[PDB]
Structures are given as structure tokens and as C-alpha cells.
From a paper:
Members of the Bep5 sub-clade are characterized by the absence of the flap. Indeed, the structure of Bcl_Bep5 shows that the Bep element is directly followed by α3. The structurally required residues of the FIC signature motif (PFxx(N/S)G) are conserved, explaining the canonical fold of the FIC loop, but most other residues of the FIC signature motif are distinct. Bcl_Bep5 FIC crystals were grown from a solution of 20% w/v PEG 3350, 0.1 M sodium citrate/citric acid, pH 4.0, and 0.2 M sodium citrate tribasic. Data for Bqu_BepC FIC, B15_Bep8 FIC, and Bcl_Bep5 FIC were collected at 100 K on a Rayonix MX-300 detector at a wavelength of 0.9786 Å on beamline 21-ID-G at the Advanced Photon Source (APS, Argonne, IL, USA).
Residue numbers in the entry:
A (entry chain B): 11 to 190, 197 to 224
B (entry chain C): 14 to 189, 198 to 224
C (entry chain A): 6 to 190, 197 to 222
Amino acid sequence: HHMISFYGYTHFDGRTLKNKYGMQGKALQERCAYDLLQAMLNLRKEPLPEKFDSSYLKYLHQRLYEKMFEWAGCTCDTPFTFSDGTVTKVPINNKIKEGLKRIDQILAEKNNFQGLSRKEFIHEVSTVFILLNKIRPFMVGNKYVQRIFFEQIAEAAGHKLDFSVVTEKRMQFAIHAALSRGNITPMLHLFEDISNPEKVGILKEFMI
Amino acid sequence: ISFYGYTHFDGRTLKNKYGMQGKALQERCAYDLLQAMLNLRKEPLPEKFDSSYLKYLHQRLYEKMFEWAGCTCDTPFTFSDGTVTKVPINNKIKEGLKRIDQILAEKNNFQGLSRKEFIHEVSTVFILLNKIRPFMVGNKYVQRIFFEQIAEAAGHKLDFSVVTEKRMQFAIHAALGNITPMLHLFEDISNPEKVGILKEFMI
Amino acid sequence: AHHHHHHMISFYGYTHFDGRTLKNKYGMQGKALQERCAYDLLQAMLNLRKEPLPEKFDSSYLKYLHQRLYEKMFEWAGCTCDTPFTFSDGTVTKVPINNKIKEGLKRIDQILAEKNNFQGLSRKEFIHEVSTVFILLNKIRPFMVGNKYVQRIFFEQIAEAAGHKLDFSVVTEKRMQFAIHAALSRGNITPMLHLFEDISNPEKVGILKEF
């Protein structure tokens, strides 16, 4: 809210994102959601990649917001220049670049988490998932691109993740647990329920 | 709803056939409404979709609850106790419904159309049917069933279950005119693949 | 019957000195407690489905469900609150005055025995039988914590054995709350009958999901 305004991603008003539509208010939210839904549809049409890295993450962020924002596949660790000459600011000590480099070597060394048991898969993904949340590569749209990212990683690893049955409060606490101490246990519990089809089915019977 | 004399002197309780009030009324109304929707599906589709069929849908849904089942609010209704309702000035309901009947007749119930053409045709009538409020209560349910059956007869399918109350409210406000949000709505709705994606984000 | 969190659970000595945290075997509090409880509860429900349905449904089986769900969570797993419970720290619980739990469970057992676990009944007869026992099982609160979940599984298994099916997923929290309050205040069981009638009807359940 104030973060997006501080680093010069909004207009002089202080809350309206600089967009390609030139829209504001509810009209902007509607137009953004429509293109975002279309982008997700085309992404599923595309086959899964052979290697998952930070570059692919930026590609996902690009495909999702290229019709809305000029800084689509760009991370906020570096100042962006709009087409009107205006520039953005960078959060001090962000550690985004060093963070993404770490994620890339892990996904390379562990062979994209392929050829693993689901129990082994959960323990490996949970660490990377938390790290990708500690650093916020993109200014806007982190939640969606991270969700799609790990959903496709899982599918390539023979496992399946269903994020539809996790509440916002559960995810917030799991992240808060190992970023405010170092308790990955709630996150482990999250992915274990999520990667378990029988448990997902039961959760759907209580999703009300 | 209170201003047009559809409730009791208390100010919040709709005049009903049950003589019930409060939470008990909401429960009883919903129960018969659910039964009514089931019975409506039991019945076959009509040959022609017009305002008369719209009133018929409204009748079947609320005939066990309200005495003004198949009645529009463009004309004063007389309850069985002598009390009368009021009519919104310059409602334009009668002329509005007459226009809808002519459109659905000339365009052959939106049949034999492409999906793109179907969206642009339904959205126009849907907005018009929202600009005017034919019934005092129960517009949302009768309009949904109305256009769902129109769509099914036109070879296309609409899933209104994945629309939030806020999105529909904005879509109506936009063209009341910007019809683009309404077009975006119906385009997502008539797209089975998009409906599935929307279901994956219903927290 | 308490309000805005339970002073009742605190008064009968089921919570810690803070006044809102249930005495648990993990020694956790707050959101951490909620997470572990939900996780263990989900695991327990999964294991309950693996085992086959019982031959007879009684109050003992009800306690069994409550045990399996909360045995990793609470020391008083399969225990009803009609009898004082002693924690492993020497502390004892109190018993709600005029609870009527013992007579209530005894009646339910007699009903389920005479009516053959509601098997061999018409759908209409099944509704009137389940609704009565459900209300009675709600009028008395056998367990201090966890009544909603154990009752749901209880009647879901009873129904499945009776050839009928109950889908509680299409019931809002407000509808159930009104239905219970209706036949507890010469009681109006009509909202309860309407609830179970919609629930045991696959066609109505399908429509409810679309609305």
C-alpha cells in the first residue's frame, strides 16, 4: 500500500499503479483480473519446461502482467524506467539477486526435485518455498507467480499440489512460523496436506 | 422495499403467505425456493423466451411465499387484506419488457449464433433487464435461470456460480455506458476452461 | 452457555491459567496450537475412513470417534464431561450442574437399538429419526470440546450404513445454528427436518453447490 507508493510505482495520488490501460479504481482492478485470467489460461496451454530457474519465474511474471505493467518480467532489485522517463526506487538491502541465485543452484543440484519420494519432495520444496517468500523479487504479483511456479515444479516431479484448499490464514502462519524463529514444521504440514489427494478431498468437504 | 409498501408497518418483514417473521421466515422462504428450483428443472424448456416466461419463473419460485408471485411492480398490487403497494415513478418496466420481447424474437432466442455474438447479445438484454427492476424482490434468481435456459437452448453454457457479488455490481454500474466489464463477465462465464480456473481460487 | 469464547471451558478447569488455552499434550498456545490440532484432526479423520463401519452405533462408538480424533491432542480424548477428569498434573475438572448427559446418551442408545441403527427405513422415516437424535445430542453436550466434528462423522456413518447419504458440506454455519436453536426454545423441529431433508437429497445438494 505505502510500499508501492514509496518506490514510485504509483501515480502522484499515491495509490494508483502506473498501467498500460491508463485506468484507475475499480475499472483498473477489473481490467487487470480479466487479462490475468487469460494469461493463466495460455500458460496451461504451454508445456512444462525442462528446467525451473529464476529466469522461468520472471517469464511467468511477464506472461501474467505484460498486458498491464511495463515492468512485467522485471524484479524490483533494480530501478525500472517507464516510457515517460520516470524511474522507480529500490528497497535497501533487498537481497533479491543473491536470493534468486541461491534458488537456481538448489533447483539445479536437486534435479528440479525430480526422482524423489513425496516425503522427500516436501522437505526439499518447503525450504525453497520459504526462501522465495523471504525475498520479494517482484513489486506486485508475487503470490500468483510463486503458486504457478511450484505447481508446475511438482507436476514435473510426479507429485501434485492443490493450493485451493489452503486458507490465507494457514499460509500466513506457516510463513510467519519460520521467518519471525525457524519453524518449518507448519510449512511441512501444509505441503503434506496439499500433496495428499485423500486429505485434499476431505478438506474440500469442510471448505465452507 | 419498505418505501413501496411491501413490508409490514414494523418496517422489515415482507408480507408473506406463511404469516411468519424474522429468521424463521428466511428459513421457510429458502426451503420453498430450493424446492421450486428443483421443480422448475423438472419442467421442459419453453418454445419462446419472453417476458411472460420470466413472470412464470418468478411465479413458480415465490408462489408459496408471496401473493404477488407472477406480478411486476409497474402496477399496484392488492393483498388479501385490502392493503396496496406503491409504484416507482417513471419505472419504464412495461416499455422495457416490450423491447426485450422484440429483441428475443428478431434474434431467434439468440440461437444459431457464434459465442462472441451470443455474449454481445445476452449482455445487452441482461443490462437492460437490470436497469429496470420488474419484480420488487427476487430479480437475481429469476434472471439467472432465465438466461441459463436461453443459453442452453443456444448451444452455449453459462456458469453464474463463479461470479462474486462485487464483480456483478460493478459490471452493472459500468454500463448504467461501459459495457466492457459485462462483456468480460459473460466471456469468462461462457468459457468452461476459465470457469475451472476461477474455481481454483475460491478460497 | 457462555459467549465470545468460552468461560465455561475455563471454569470447569479445561484451560490454562491464561484463561483460554486448552490443556494439551504438546504444551502449545495460540495459532501454533490451532495448527497442530487441525493437522492431527485431519490425520485422524483419514484413518477413520480406512477402517470399516461398525455393526452397532451407540454412545460408546461416539466416544471412540472423539477418542480417535483428539487422543494425540487432549488427555481426556474419549471422555465425556459428565465425570470429573484428572490431568497428569494432578488437576481435576468440574462437572456442569444438571448436565443430563448420562440420561441423554442412555436414551440415544435405546433409540438406536430399537430402530436397528435406522436401517431398513424409508427416507422420510430416516429424516425424522436422525433429526430427533441429533437435537438430543445437541441439547446435551457430552464432550467439553469437539462436539461438532464427532457428531458429523457419527451421523455420516449411520446414514451410509442405512443406505442414505448425508452431505454436511452444503450447510452454512448460520443455518445449523438456527435449526438447533429452533428446537431448544414446545420446540420447533421443523427447521431441523428441512435441513436433513435437503441434505439427504442428492439433487438438492447439487443445486446448493451451484448457488
